[PDB]
Paper text:
Here we present the functional and structural characterization of Iripin-8, a salivary serpin from the tick Ixodes ricinus, a European vector of tick-borne encephalitis and Lyme disease. Iripin-8 inhibited multiple proteases involved in blood coagulation and blocked the intrinsic and common pathways of the coagulation cascade in vitro. Moreover, Iripin-8 inhibited erythrocyte lysis by complement, and Iripin-8 knockdown by RNA interference in tick nymphs delayed the feeding time. Based on its inhibitory activity, mainly of proteases of the coagulation cascade, we suggest that its main role as a salivary protein is in the modulation of host blood coagulation and complement activity, with possible function in regulating the immune response.
Finally, we resolved the crystal structure of Iripin-8 at 1.89 Å resolution to reveal an unusually long and rigid reactive center loop that is conserved in several tick species. The crystallographic asymmetric unit contained a single molecule of native Iripin-8. Electron density was of sufficient quality to model all residues from Ser5 to the C-terminus, including the entire RCL. Iripin-8 has the typical native serpin fold with a Cα RMSD (root-mean-square deviation) of 1.93 Å compared with the archetypal serpin alpha-1-antitrypsin (A1AT, 342 of 352 residues). The most remarkable feature of Iripin-8 is its long RCL (11 residues longer on the P′ side), which extends away from the body of the serpin, moving the P1 Arg364 17.8 Å further than the P1 residue of A1AT. This extended conformation is not the result of a crystal contact; rather it forms the basis of a crystal contact with the RCL of a symmetry-related molecule. The P′ extension contains a stretch of proline residues that form a type II polyproline helix, conferring rigidity and extending the P1 residue away from the body of Iripin-8. We can infer from this that the extended RCL is a feature of native Iripin-8 in solution and that it has functional consequences in determining protease specificity and/or inhibitory promiscuity. We also observed several molecules of PEG (polyethylene glycol) originating from the crystallization buffer bound to Iripin-8. One of the binding sites was a deep 109 Å3 cavity in the core structure between helixes A, B, and C.
Residue numbers in the entry: 5 to 96, 97C, 98 to 386
Amino acid sequence: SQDKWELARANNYLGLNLLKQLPSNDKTNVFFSPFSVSTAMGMAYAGARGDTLEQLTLNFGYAADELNEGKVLALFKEQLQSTNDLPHDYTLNIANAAVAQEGYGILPEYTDALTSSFGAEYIEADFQKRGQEAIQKINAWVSNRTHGKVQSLFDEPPDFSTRLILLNAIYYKGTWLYEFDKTKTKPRSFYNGGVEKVQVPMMRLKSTLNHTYNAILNADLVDLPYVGNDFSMTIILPREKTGLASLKSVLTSQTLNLALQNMYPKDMKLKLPKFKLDTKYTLKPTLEAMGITKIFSADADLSGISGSRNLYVSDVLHKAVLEVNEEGSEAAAVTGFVIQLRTAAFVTPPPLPKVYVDHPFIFLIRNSKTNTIMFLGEINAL
């Protein structure tokens, strides 16, 4: 459907723009869920009016009158049901909420939209008088919704003047279609920051994988499907050891899709690090860098939340957790070299091609059906 495609495109545009705007250095890994950020923007969209709404939509190239709010919420609703219907092999715990200063008003149309479209809760708290209790209620909510994988979003009470905060926490561990062999996992060389050689737990696979070399990105792309090929992890490995910054500067929704369309199966050797990521961002400054300003300003119009223009977003908090290890459903298979033999002979198959993920790279976990990027990582450092 062209509508599902348009939502995946907005989502992927937001994700790759976030990646170019997030603070980073050669010693720390970036990891976030564009899907979670899209959900925080969806929650604002469902309640925004006037110039606040027009800035949100025009950011994605739409006048508010080129959109049906109903059809946008229905596309989010469809996305939510597809994630709730994932098999047991996927551990995906999503926690979405708006937390408002008490006594501003809540429209049931808005809380109904939060539940059905976003799996989101609306929570009232007193940041002025009961800041300490507000963070105990939030920490308990996120702990409950993430099955204890995220215990806290706040260490200290937020500011006296806090009006509304958007919270999006997500945990993911998937099962590979093709298991890596636990016995082949060893410390192997990785270039931290593209420069500093260290030994790190490296998994080893020999299998038929979708792959392409893409000249515009100057990178190998490898697809590793999860079970039911519902999600796949795309590795984008720059050919230059220090190529990551260059890769980031040319990676767009357009250039990614062109590379993905050229992938075809082949037998290959893959070396991929075993790693866990746990990241937390205060997204207001990054979203403002991208041109989302009015939701955060004193002139915000979120009258679709409360029934009046009395709310603005104090901040957007995002926490994302990923585990990557060997576990898969089926053993690794290679097709082998196919030859039509006429005359009996000694036949030497050509050497298998190699993608050794041994320097900084990007990965995307995406919905194979819709090409929605669920997760995006830059690994600089293991």
